């Protein structure tokens, strides 16, 4: 059983947020209830609404006039529409459902903002200078969040740190991702950072090579 949210990462103020929850490995018609919960960055969980197998819906009263939850049995998915959004609706949105233990999706960040999508530039943090070397990638000047960074297509996970992005005074985010590796590897082992800014459909594979000093 897998739940996966999908929907735009950026919505403009006053417009309608639409999200979908694709259900795999389980027939959407068989589920006892399906629902949505959201989590503003840095904050706690807020229930949005649920729908039961019968079609009956229940919504958070503080959101009720703006929420629609529905199910499409044929697409095997269910949906959330939230009208008239403001910055207050910026959050990670989770779909969940009970088939004792609800399945949760992985969540999708929706940012409500009048700023526009902008893809990142990817710059190397080249190794240089205790038998260990640090290297990384600087993922700069993108909007909205998030970006994901892997190393060597997922083969390199030990010693990786991908930092929280910072919101620059420019209104754009920047993020660094680093890894520490044996100094003796730098001549022979290729290090590539795999960057993926889904809001802008920007994917970059950047080789990080030792500088000449």
């Amino acid at each position: 059983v897998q739940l996966q949210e999908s929907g735009p990462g950026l919505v403009k103020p006053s417009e309608t947020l639409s999200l979908t929850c694709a259900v795999s490995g389980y027939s959407i018609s068989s589920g006892y209830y399906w629902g949505w919960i959201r989590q503003p960055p840095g904050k706690g969980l807020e229930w949005i609404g649920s729908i039961y197998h019968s079609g009956s819906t229940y919504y958070n009263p503080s959101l009720k006039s703006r929420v629609t939850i529905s199910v499409d049995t044929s697409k095997n998915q269910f949906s959330l529409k939230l009208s008239s959004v403001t910055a207050a609706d910026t959050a990670v949105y989770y779909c969940a459902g009970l088939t004792n233990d609800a399945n949760w999706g992985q969540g999708t960040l929706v940012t409500v903002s009048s700023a526009s999508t902008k893809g990142p530039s990817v710059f190397p943090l080249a190794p240089s200078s205790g038998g260990t070397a640090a290297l990384g990638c600087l993922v700069k000047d993108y909007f909205p969040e998030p970006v994901t960074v892997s190393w060597n297509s997922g083969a390199l996970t030990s010693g990786v740190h991908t930092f929280p992005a910072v919101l620059q005074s420019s209104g754009l985010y920047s993020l660094s991702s680093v890894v520490t590796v044996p100094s003796s590897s730098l001549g022979t082992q290729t290090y590539i950072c795999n960057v993926n800014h889904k809001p802008s459909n920007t994917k970059v594979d950047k080789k990080v090579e030792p500088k000449s000093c």
Partner: protein, 213 residues
Amino acid sequence: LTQPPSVSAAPGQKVTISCSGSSSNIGNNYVSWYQQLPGTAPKLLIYDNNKRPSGIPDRFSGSKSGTSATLGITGLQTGDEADYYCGTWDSSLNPVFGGGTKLEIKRTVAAPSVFIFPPSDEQLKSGTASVVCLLNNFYPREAKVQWKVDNALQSGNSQESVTEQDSKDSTYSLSSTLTLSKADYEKHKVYACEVTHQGLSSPVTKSFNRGEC
């Protein structure tokens, strides 16, 4: 539903996390508990006050007494660091959640390893210079980074961010970025990051001279 912002203890010890509610939520209804490891969805630990779903180990337990409920975690290990949430139903039988408690594992002190990265030539060509100072795998979280450019203390033109405790060694890492324009970067030679941390007998400075790499 109120819970404390944080709780901490050493590996192998026990913590409790309490959820204080009212007669009309916890007082009338079942209580669930959730673990939210950073970047993942909440995961159910306890339901119906005290029941563990399949695959949750008996290090976790729950109970309810009057208008409060408590999660216990024994045998604390690296990788238990997470936000823990209680959930129940309100007077309308709609889900409500506590604000979250962040668990910190109190490991031994570890001084950071420090690395400094000049801007890449690629970024410089585009008109900006990001200088990055990395503080790797330290404990506890308190750390101070001071930037100096030809011995001029930099105030207000840097931003930093810190990872969550590491799932293998319970340390933090921190990345600080100093931003200058290209024209300003080319006006100076010596770029230095000085790091203060309880694990260091005196502050550590990493520096480079512009143009040596």
